[PDB]
Structure 1
């Protein structure tokens, strides 16, 4: 069993996007009108699942090989690497990082995606990696393309990869999106503009990593994730 020995730095809800962001239409009916009730951290909030004993497949992180129907996917071959640290800069080892995206044309392998860009018979779009001792993760995929959506009459989502990070607790569990360096669609997207601070948007932009690129093969992008700062309990209950 797990023990209550950790405390997590309180979330800055002015840094994160607000619940009600009108330009992103679906958020109007799906946001609370009442205020969130603040509760102190206990064993329920400070503990979380550890996925070290989960059986990962050999190609679970390799989106170029985990679907495979006798071929390679069409699109810009890239490596998406980075490190998962907390707010104190301390690495987060053996944590679960899950990712999903669309193909080179902006089409997802889902029944609800009725977009006219075709599917890639060799691309699924799912990945999962367990961070190492130093908090490092790596994925091999193709660069996803942008896609339109029914929000505004001419709205386009930028090229992105959705990310899900577990962390040491359910208090650190985060779901976010990675964007690509220089994409002109970033300042136009309502989901990106749900974030009020422009410095907060910068944390979501993956930078081109030529150093980590494989010559004559694939490019690379760096994306570091910062989870809530973990500290030990002190002076509690006197």
Structure 2
């Protein structure tokens, strides 16, 4: 199999750069259209991260910053599969996550929300997907929080995530939400995505058979990256 380029990104499946209901985008969006280029080796390659460098608790946000006790909040496991658009698993991709604590407070200097800080929660983790594209991490469910867009704007609970995988063209940062959160219907950031089916693609689903008795609940969330096409005739990449 000789690989060709990644399938073109479908711009209608993503938010546009300029989205007036998300006020900060008004001055941080290019006025010119993006220039589409044909891919080269620069766009189809990406770095490799070795598992050797990851610590044992890097995917365990409940314990990786615990000092005197356990963080306060709802214990949850999140797991799922990363695949490309043609359904192939994405192996050894680096998944990084960050989030607020149970109060909706981030452990960042600029976050001065009154929601209380948790001395035993850090809020960041990372993992590499396995050969089946599977990933699993444990955390405390984040709380929603207020932010200044309109004065009473509130984000639904969410976990931020980032993926570095096989090709630079696949580079993606997004956010997933929790099934049933009522703030999902009102969020101007989630509403930058044009279609309802794509908004639903960011909701992690309750996975009841995988709850761990007297311990933790579980959410299932799958991620799809751009996929490469195979070449059978002229290989113009190089």
Partners of 2:18 and 2:26 within 8 A in 1: yes
1:200 maps to 198
Partners of 2:6 and 2:229 within 8 A in 1: yes
Counterparts of 1:233 and 1:191, CA distance in 2: 38
Partners of 2:160 and 2:173 within 8 A in 1: yes
Q: Can you list the C-alpha shifts for 1:152-205, whole angstroms capped at 9, x where unaligned?
A: 021000000000011211100100001000111011000000011010001000
Counterparts of 1:175 and 1:237, CA distance in 2: 30
Matches within 5 A, 1:136-215: 136-215=134-213
Counterparts of 2:4 and 2:110, CA distance in 1: 42
1:52 maps to 50
Partners of 2:3 and 2:228 within 8 A in 1: no
Q: 1:91 Cα shift?
A: 0.4
2:221 maps to 223
Matches within 5 A, 1:110-149: 110-149=108-147
5+ residue gaps, structure 1: none
Q: Can you list the C-alpha shifts for 1:118-175, whole angstroms capped at 9, x where unaligned?
A: 1100000000011111000001001000000010021000000000011211100100
Question: With structure 2 as the length reference, what TM-score do the two structures score?
Answer: 0.96
Q: Can you list the C-alpha shifts for 1:4-46, whole angstroms capped at 9, x where unaligned?
A: 9442111111110000000000000000100111110000001
**Greater displacement, 45-54 / 87-96:** 45-54
Counterparts of 1:202 and 1:53, CA distance in 2: 32
Q: Secondary structure at the match of 2:66?
A: coil
Question: With structure 1 as the length reference, what TM-score do the two structures score?
Answer: 0.96
Q: Secondary structure at the match of 1:211?
A: helix
Counterparts of 2:234 and 2:150, CA distance in 1: 51
Q: 1:53 Cα shift?
A: 4.9
Counterparts of 2:69 and 2:51, CA distance in 1: 31
Counterparts of 1:6 and 1:87, CA distance in 2: 15
Counterparts of 1:230 and 1:66, CA distance in 2: 36
User: Which of 52, 59, 62 pairs up with 2:60?
Assistant: 62
Structure with a larger share of its residues in helix: 2
Q: 1:213 Cα shift?
A: 1.3
5+ residue gaps, structure 2: none
2:231 maps to 233
Q: Secondary structure at the match of 1:186?
A: helix
**Greater displacement, 26-35 / 44-53:** 44-53
Divergent runs of 4+, >4 A: none
2:80 maps to 82
